[PDB]
Structure formats: structure tokens, C-alpha cells
TrEMBL record, chains A, B:
Its EC number is 1.14.13.1. Its cofactor is FAD. Gene3D superfamilies: FAD/NAD(P)-binding domain. SUPFAM superfamilies: FAD-linked reductases, C-terminal domain, FAD/NAD(P)-binding domain. This is Probable salicylate monooxygenase. One of its GO terms (molecular function) is salicylate 1-monooxygenase activity. Residues 5-344 form the FAD-binding domain. FAD binds at G15, E34, R35, Q47, R108, V132, D286, A299, V300. 3-hydroxybenzoate binds at Q47, Y209. Keywords: FAD, Flavoprotein, Monooxygenase, Nucleotide-binding, Oxidoreductase.
Length: 389, 389
């Protein structure tokens, strides 16, 4: 366990929250600083596969999350031009047995609030409206600076400040890499859908799934922005959606009418990095490994990061104390980097596979149609992973 | 049978020769005019699948052709970058039973000479060094003009003057369509090869097969020419081969050193046309349906054209006489156009599937690897076709 240890977390997204929970359940003294004036997430959906669900269950929050979630029966891929089914991934009891948990979908806002609340319950001290301005290591401590002029000492600091992480600059000068694709979301108060459906087409895709016991439908449009390639600064705006989808089936074109249009998510990732550690600071979540969303595992990775850190630290700290932290951070980095970096790189290829045109589309469609649906070789690496040693 | 009928064939390629044979075996009076001063073909290989082999057997020339041919055990597709096997088509006894004949490979020069000789044996009158300059229909005759000033009358004329057919201009003003790919051939006096091997890579492919009882190896390089896209008039020259293949496996790069470099075949086809008939002239072979070579069926199609024409004419002429010819030509066109035009259009897609790059290549490779190799659904339409009614 971790009662002698103090950890400061910079950032209160799903990642920071999950880490606060995991670490506080082990008895650690956790202080989290979130820049925003309140905790909150987008009132739209995310998908959480069993690689995340198993971990939420281990923290005792799964039943509660599920009470407000939806359990899809399948993931269904369809051709975006014809609407024909290409293949399904069955999410039933055989899937759940193999992977240790359900594939579920829920609101981001609810998952985030549930983690925050549980982190509070377990003894984590969460502070909104506080920005971390610097983190250094001096001797056997992380020294964290905040925007109110104060400095705080801890045994380690977690850099969990997202895709646009400034703390990542301590380790890497890289910039986000544009995919050239943008994402729009919508929910609409709810032919019928009880699955995650993904329509995959030339330079575009469209995803639908139910939320909250089937009352609402989550919709997401991902498309190649011509403005990006043309050098537009604020690229992927909604003027682009009609042409992006014009070649698709009616089922998909109808969907576009529900998207929220006042806001969108231009899709960027970063090139994978092996080293996440700077003294007694470690980058986790998107600050370390921000993906493109095709594997629906960014938030999941962050949740995995939390389980790994807390587990490995509870294992090592009880025998080595606060002197052990640099070895613990190294071990966590060693475990997590190959996993997450494969998700980054594979995710790029997987999205490219969605968006193929011409003959490449014809080959892709046939590949998906003819597969051995009883094999798990395309998904075990993702859903069957665990950090447990 | 056809003894009261006279047919003039314009062109003495594999097509014209096959037609002369088929028609002469039915008792027709055949006159063929070939522009070149002698009969002859390239001393390199072609492939003849059972859709052609069955027909050669029906004319009694297969055993003889095979005595000088090679019988590959498989068609083997390999990745051109890694050299790894993607899939095989087994050409064994189950294949031969299903399709009515062997898949064989031989020299073009030998197949052509064997057809000519058999056409001579069966009573066809072949004339070298004579160019057909015009063909018209007047009343119930085709009137054919030749370059020595003479005109010749026949019941029908076959326009078999190849890819650059001038007689096709009577029906269509289309021009050949560049694929942007060029082909090089080589033979070399013969790790070992007893199959047709096709290495398929990004913007390039490389084909190898044995000839003449395994003594010689036929090699063919097909690649995307950057000069074509850059507007070079005589595009696809040998200065382009080193860069075209630089990214490929050694097995393929070694092969390029054997190609004959003083001559190449820039690959063109034509858009499919439904109507091949102008009065009492019909376009057959490449004049009607010149393909890109990925289905290895251009000469085969021409041989099929000959069987169909001779069969349908022998069926109808015995009851309707020379008055029947326009109906016979219509029926032949009706049968052959959908078949051949599917080969044209599918052949384009099939070559595109060979030459995919990036993620599309990854999907293609997996498609080929995981297929049900006992299914014949991808090949029955090609190899199991017959004109017999
Ligand atoms: C499972 C859905 C259908 C996926 C269909 C085919 C996907 C990709 C084909 C290209 C990849 C071929 C890789 C061949 C080697 C292989 O199987 O590697 C295997 C690893 O494969 C891979 O690493 C495959 C990586 C690409 C596919 C990922 C599919 C993920 C499905 C998740 C969906 C998320 C949410 C959807 C939101 C709408 C290991 O094979 P082994 O034989 O060594 O064991
Ligand atoms: C047999 C070799 C491996 C081919 C692997 C997959 C090829 C193409 C995949 C894309 C086509 C998917 C078509 C799906 C529908 C289908 O199967 O149509 C089927 C028709 O398929 C087609 O029409 C397929 C056309 C494209 C493939 C042609 C393969 C020809 C192999 C010949 C090689 C020649 C020489 C090589 C020289 C090196 C009919 O299916 P159904 O279910 O209606 O019966
Ligand atoms: C369209 C889309 C769909 C997606 N769908 C899925 C999905 O279905 N499933 C999935 O698992 N993932 C998905 N993801 C990925 C997922 O949203 C992210 O990977 C994840 O939310 C990252 O969590 P995080 O806590 O690391 O970073 P963020 O969520 O970015 O949180 C960072 C937090 O740090 C705060 N902050 C920043 N700087 C400072 C500072 N200096 N001091 C203090 N606080 C600071 C920010 O205000 C913010 O709250 C999706 C992403 C997109 C864009
Ligand atoms: C690289 C490559 C590889 C190929 N491989 C294969 C394969 O493995 N299998 C396969 O089945 N096919 C293959 N083909 C296709 C095949 O070569 C052709 O489809 C076929 O030879 C066409 O035969 P043809 O008689 O219609 O036309 P051609 O062979 O073009 O014959 C036309 C003849 O007409 C003569 N002529 C022209 N104008 C006149 C005139 N006015 N008067 C008199 N005579 C005239 C010409 O001199 C010529 O001999 C390949 C083609 C290429 C380019
Ligand atoms: O919001 C999602 O669930 C999602 C999942 C995958 C890709 C994407 O753009 C979005
Ligand atoms: O010469 C061949 O056998 C051949 C077959 C297919 C494609 C190609 O370019 C050549
Ligand atoms: Cl994601
Ligand atoms: Cl051909």
C-alpha cells in the first residue's frame, strides 16, 4: 500500500481522475490540480471495451457505471455506400468470458463524474481552478508550481494534461500530427439500433450507438477535410459535411442532420515516444500517448495507466519506500509504452482501412466479409491485454 | 457444316489463325489475309487456361501443343516486397476435372505456328503479305479490298486486325486507353520453379514460369511508368526499370536483369463495346475486345471467339444457308460481348488489386492469405465458361 506517499496529478480529465482513484484506493495521499473551474466532460458517448471495463470493476465502480450505460450486443461494420453489413464482432457471453468484462458505451460526462466522485470517496483531494505551471525534480521530490504562486512537494508528479500537454515539453519538443480528418458528434433523443454501428466509406465514416438504456442515440461523423489539405487554419468546419458524405447511403446522410454543428474535433495524434519519465514526473494518458480514435481506446489507455501505476507502486513501495519511486516509474513506462504505442501506430492503419476507395475498398469489403468470425486474432492484443505481473 | 460458305479473315494473329482453323474444320472456304510477310509470334511465353485448352482439344491440336508446352502445378501469388507466399491456385486433377482441361503455358510462337499449320491442314487458304484496306457490305455479301488493287467477295468477313484495328473504325471511333503500365519480357535458359509465379507489389509486378519441359524460364515485368504520367510519347522505356523495382525483394530485382530491354509492350486496352457487327463484317479477337493482360485471357478470348462462330454458324447455316449469316453474327455478338467485356472490366480491377500500396496492400495480402482455397467462386466465371448451347 501507499500511505507514506504523496502524489500530485496535473490534470483532471478521465485520465487524471482514474489515476487519483486508483492511487487513493491504495492509501496514497493524492492531490490533483484541474485548470477548469469545474469537473465535467462532453455530454456525448464513448466506448469502453473490456480492457477498460475489467479495471473499473477492480475499483468497484463498474456496476454503478453500468446502471447508467448501455450494453451493445455487437460491433457492426457496414459499407457506407451500400449500407450492407460487412462483419460483426459479437459482444456476448463468450466475448465477456474471454476478455474478463463487458464492452459498454456510456456518456463521457457520466463516466468522468463517477470516477471523480469515487476518487473523492477514496480520499483524493481534488482542486478545480488550479493550473500547474511547472514541475521539476530536486533530490527525491517532485516540486510542482501552480498559478496562485505556490509550490508543492510530492514524491512523484503525474503529467496528465492532455493532447496539448505543456509538461510533455520537458521530454519532447514534438507537435501534434494532423490526421486530416475531423470528427462531429451528436446525440439525439432516440431500422432500430442495439449495436455499435460503424459505416465505413471512401474518406469518411459514421458511427452510431445507443446510450442510457436505449433512450438516446449517439452519432459521430469522421471525414477527410479538404480544407486541411488546402491549408485552412481552423479546418474541418461544417460547411464541409454535405460534400464529404454526398456519395454515401441515405442511412448515413440522414445521420449527418443530427450532428451538433457548432463544435467539432479535428483529429490529431502524436508520433509514439518510448520515454515518458523526467525524474519524478511521468506523463500519462493523452499527454504520453494521444491516439486517433479508431480503436476507441484513448480513455481506456489512461485508465490502464492508472491501474498499472497503482499496482506496480503498491507492489514496490511497501518494501522500498519513497526511494523506490524512480524504479516504479521506469517499470510502469516499460510496461505501458509498447502497449500504448502499438495502439497509436495500429490505430492509424485501422482508420486508413476504414477509409479506402476504389479497388482497395472492394478488397477490404471482401476481407471483412469472409473472415473467420470465431478467431480473435485481430483483437486479442487489444482487449486481452493486462498489466498484471 | 459450311461447304457452301466463303469467309474472309482480315489478320493472321492467334485470333485469325484460330478462326481459320475452326471454320475450315467445318468445311467452310476460308481465305485469310495477313499483312506481315510471314507468319510468326514472339518467342516468349503465354498462358492458356482450360477455357482455351478445352477448345484446342476440340480442334484436335491440344496433344500436339502440349508436347512442346509446360504444365505448371500451381499459380502462386507472392508479395513482391517480402517474397512471401500469399496464396496458390492448385492446377491439379480436381481443377482439370472441373474446367474440362489443363492450365498450360507455351511459347506464343509455337502456339501460333501450330494453329496456322492445322488451319492449312483443314483447308484454309492463308496469304501472307496482303493487307486488307476496306470491307463493305453490298446486298448479301461482304466485299473485301486488298492492297494489290483487288476486291474479293465472301459471305462474311472477320475483322481480326488487333489492338490498333482500323476495321473497328467502321463501328467505333474510340482510341486505345493507356493503363500507364508497361510490360517487358525475357526468356532465359533455365529456389526452383515448376509453377506460374506472380510477385505483386506497389505499382509493379513480376511473373515467372517455365517453358518447354522446364528448360527455359519465361519472365515478365509489369510496372507503372512515371514517364506516362509525365507525358512522354514513347513511354515505359528501360531506364525506368531500376527505380520501378528498387523497393522489391532480391528474387524480383535479380529477375529484371534477364529481361530483353530493346523492346517493350506499353499496356493499353479499350473501353468495352456491345456491338461488333457492321453488316456482314464482325470484329473478333483484340479488334473487338483488347484487354490488359492480368487475366491472361486475350488470346484465349480470340480462340473462344473462333469456337463460338464456327459452332453457331454450323448450327444455323445448314438450315438457313448464306441468308442466315446476319443472324449468326448477331448471335455470336450476343454471346461473346458480355463474356469478353467482363474480362476487360474485371481485368482492370484485378491488375489494380495487384498493384496496391500502404494499408490497401496490407488488406489485399490478408485477403489472399485467408481465403477458402477450396472455393472456385473467384474463377468459375472465367475458367468454367463455355459458348456451347
Ligand atoms: C475484427 C474486425 C475485422 C478486422 C478485419 C481485418 C482487419 C485488418 C486486416 C489487416 C491486418 C492483417 C494482420 C495480419 C496478421 C494478424 O492477424 O495479426 C494479429 C494482430 O492483428 C492486428 O494487430 C490487427 C490490427 C488491426 C485491426 C484491429 C481491429 C480492431 C477492432 C476494434 C474495433 C474498435 C471500435 C469500433 C468503433 C466503430 C495477430 O495474429 P497472430 O496470428 O500472430 O496471433
Ligand atoms: C483466386 C485468386 C485469389 C483472388 C483473391 C480475391 C480476389 C478478389 C477479391 C475482390 C473481389 C471480391 C468479389 C466478391 C464477390 C465474388 O466473389 O464474385 C464471384 C466472382 O468473382 C470475380 O469476378 C472476381 C474477379 C477478380 C478476381 C479474378 C481472379 C482471377 C485469377 C486468375 C489468374 C490469372 C493468371 C495469373 C497470372 C500471374 C462470384 O461469386 P458468387 O458468390 O456470386 O458465386
Ligand atoms: C471524437 C473522439 C472520440 C473518442 N472516443 C473514445 C472512445 O470511445 N473511447 C476511448 O477510450 N477514448 C476515446 N477518445 C479518446 C479520449 O477522449 C482521450 O484519450 C482521453 O479523454 C484523454 O484523457 P486525459 O485525461 O489524458 O486527457 P484530457 O481529457 O485531455 O484531460 C486533460 C485535463 O488536463 C487539464 N489541464 C490541462 N493543462 C493543465 C495544467 N497545466 N494544469 C492543470 N490542469 C490542466 C485539462 O483542462 C483537462 O481536463 C476519443 C477522442 C475523441 C477526440
Ligand atoms: C505482354 C502481354 C502478355 C499477354 N499474355 C497473354 C496470355 O498469357 N494469355 C492470353 O490468352 N493472352 C495474352 N495476351 C493477349 C494476347 O497477346 C492478345 O489478346 C492476342 O494475341 C490478340 O490476338 P489477335 O489475333 O486478335 O490480334 P494480333 O495478335 O494483334 O493479330 C492481328 C494481326 O492482324 C495483322 N493485321 C493488321 N492489320 C491488318 C490488315 N489491314 N490486313 C491484314 N492483316 C492485318 C497483324 O499484322 C497481326 O498479325 C498478352 C498480351 C500482352 C501485350
Ligand atoms: O466517439 C466514439 O465512440 C468514436 C470511436 C471511434 C472513432 C471515433 O471517431 C469516435
Ligand atoms: O505474359 C504473360 O503470361 C502475362 C500474364 C499476365 C500479365 C502479364 O503482364 C503477362
Ligand atoms: Cl481513442
Ligand atoms: Cl491478356
Amino acid at each position: 500500500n501507499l500511505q507514506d506517499a504523496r502524489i500530485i496529478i496535473a490534470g483532471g480529465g478521465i485520465g487524471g481522475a482514474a489515476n487519483a482513484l486508483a492511487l487513493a484506493q491504495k492509501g496514497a495521499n493524492v492531490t490533483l490540480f484541474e485548470r477548469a473551474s469545474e469537473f465535467g466532460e462532453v455530454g456525448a458517448g464513448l466506448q469502453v471495451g473490456p480492457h477498460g471495463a475489467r479495471i473499473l470493476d477492480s475499483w468497484g465502480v463498474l456496476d454503478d457505471v453500468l446502471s447508467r450505460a448501455f450494453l451493445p450486443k455487437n460491433i457492426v461494420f457496414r459499407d457506407a455506400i451500400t449500407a450492407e453489413v460487412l462483419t460483426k464482432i459479437d459482444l456476448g457471453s463468450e466475448f465477456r468470458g474471454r476478455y474478463g468484462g463487458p464492452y459498454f458505451v456510456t456518456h463521457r460526462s457520466d463516466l468522468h463524474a463517477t470516477l471523480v466522485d469515487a476518487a473523492r470517496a477514496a480520499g483524493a483531494e481534488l482542486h478545480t481552478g488550479v493550473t500547474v505551471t511547472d514541475v521539476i525534480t530536486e533530490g527525491d521530490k517532485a516540486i510542482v508550481s501552480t498559478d496562485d504562486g505556490r509550490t508543492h512537494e510530492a514524491d512523484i508528479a503525474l503529467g496528465m494534461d492532455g493532447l496539448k500537454s505543456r509538461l510533455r515539453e520537458k521530454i519532447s519538443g514534438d507537435e501534434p500530427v494532423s490526421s486530416g480528418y475531423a470528427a462531429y458528434r451528436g446525440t439525439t433523443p432516440y431500422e432500430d439500433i442495439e449495436d455499435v454501428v460503424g459505416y465505413i466509406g471512401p474518406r469518411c465514416s459514421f458511427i452510431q450507438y445507443p446510450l442510457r438504456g436505449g433512450e438516446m442515440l449517439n452519432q459521430v461523423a469522421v471525414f477527410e477535410s479538404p480544407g486541411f489539405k488546402n491549408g485552412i487554419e481552423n479546418w474541418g468546419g461544417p460547411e464541409e459535411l454535405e460534400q464529404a458524405y454526398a456519395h454515401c447511403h441515405e442511412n448515413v446522410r440522414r445521420g449527418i442532420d443530427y450532428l451538433w454543428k457548432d463544435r467539432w474535433w479535428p483529429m490529431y495524434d502524436r508520433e509514439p515516444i518510448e520515454n515518458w519519465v523526467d525524474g519524478r514526473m511521468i506523463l500519462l494518458g493523452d499527454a504520453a500517448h494521444p491516439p486517433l480514435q479508431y480503436l476507441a481506446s484513448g480513455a481506456v489507455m489512461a485508465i490502464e495507466d492508472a491501474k498499472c501505476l497503482a499496482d506496480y507502486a503498491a507492489e514496490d513501495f511497501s518494501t522500498g519506500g519513497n526511494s523506490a519511486w524512480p524504479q516504479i516509474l521506469k517499470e510502469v513506462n516499460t510496461e505501458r509504452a509498447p502497449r500504448c504505442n502499438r495502439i497509436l501506430t495500429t490505430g492509424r492503419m485501422w482508420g486508413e482501412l476504414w477509409h479506402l476507395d476504389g479497388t482497395a475498398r472492394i478488397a477490404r469489403n471482401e476481407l471483412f466479409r469472409t473472415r473467420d468470425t470465431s478467431s480473435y486474432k485481430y483483437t486479442d492484443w487489444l482487449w486481452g491485454y493486462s498489466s498484471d505481473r
